[PDB]
């Protein structure tokens, strides 16, 4: 997709065949390149923001929903994200990847078939 290709170009090292195989299969290894790639995608799809964190409503919708997010989805993810103390993570890519880890369970369940967390 458009955003994968662009982000692989915007992120040093991400235009890598072997990483891009993982990316198109929705797997995101814990490595500095992938950290920045994940940040780039979240930024481009407006799922994430360095300052305001994760848009929980936008991610809900990115999980195949068109309604207001379940309250318990919002609650659980806000709590997950706050437990990660994202504001204390100096590297912006690592911060974004850490944030994303809260939503991994959700994305995987979906792949198997605005509510900013930091206002
Ligand atoms: N590139
Ligand atoms: N958004
Ligand atoms: N709800
Ligand atoms: N946080």
SS3 sequence, 64-78?
CCCCCCCHHHHHHHH
Say which residues have a Cβ less than 8 Å from residue 81's Cβ, sequence separation at least 6.
53, 54, 99, 102, 117, 118
**Are the CB atoms for 102 and 80 separated by under 8 Å?**
yes
Nearest to 48 by CA among 112, 12, 102: 102
Whole-number Å distance between alpha carbons of 10 and 30: 19
Does ligand 3 come within 6 angstroms of the Cβ of 70? Answer: yes
DSSP class of 53: E
Closest ligand to residue 47's CA: 2
- Domain boundaries of the chain, sorted by first residue: 1-119
Residue with tokens 């040093």: 12
The domain made up of 1-119 is a member of CATH 1.10.238.20: yes
Whole-number Å distance between alpha carbons of 40 and 33: 11
Which technique? X-ray
Distance 36 CA to ligand 1 centre (A): 13
Protein residue closest via CA to atom 1 of ligand 2 = 46
Whole-number Å distance between alpha carbons of 13 and 100: 20
Say which residues have a Cβ less than 8 Å from residue 71's Cβ, sequence separation at least 6.
none
Does ligand 4 come within 6 angstroms of the Cβ of 82? Answer: yes
Structure resolution in Å? Answer: 2.0
């Amino acid at each position: 997709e458009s955003v994968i290709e662009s982000c692989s170009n915007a992120v040093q090292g991400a235009a890598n065949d072997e990483l891009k195989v993982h990316y198109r299969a929705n797997e995101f290894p814990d490595d500095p390149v992938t950290h920045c790639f994940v940040r780039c995608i979240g930024l481009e799809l407006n799922l994430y923001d360095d300052k305001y964190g994760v848009d929980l409503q936008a991610n809900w919708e990115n999980l195949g929903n068109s309604d207001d997010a379940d309250e318990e989805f919002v609650a659980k993810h806000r709590a997950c994200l706050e437990a990660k103390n994202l504001e204390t993570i100096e590297d912006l890519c690592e911060r974004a990847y850490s944030a994303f880890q809260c939503l991994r369970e959700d994305y995987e369940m979906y792949q198997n078939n605005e509510l900013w967390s930091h206002p």
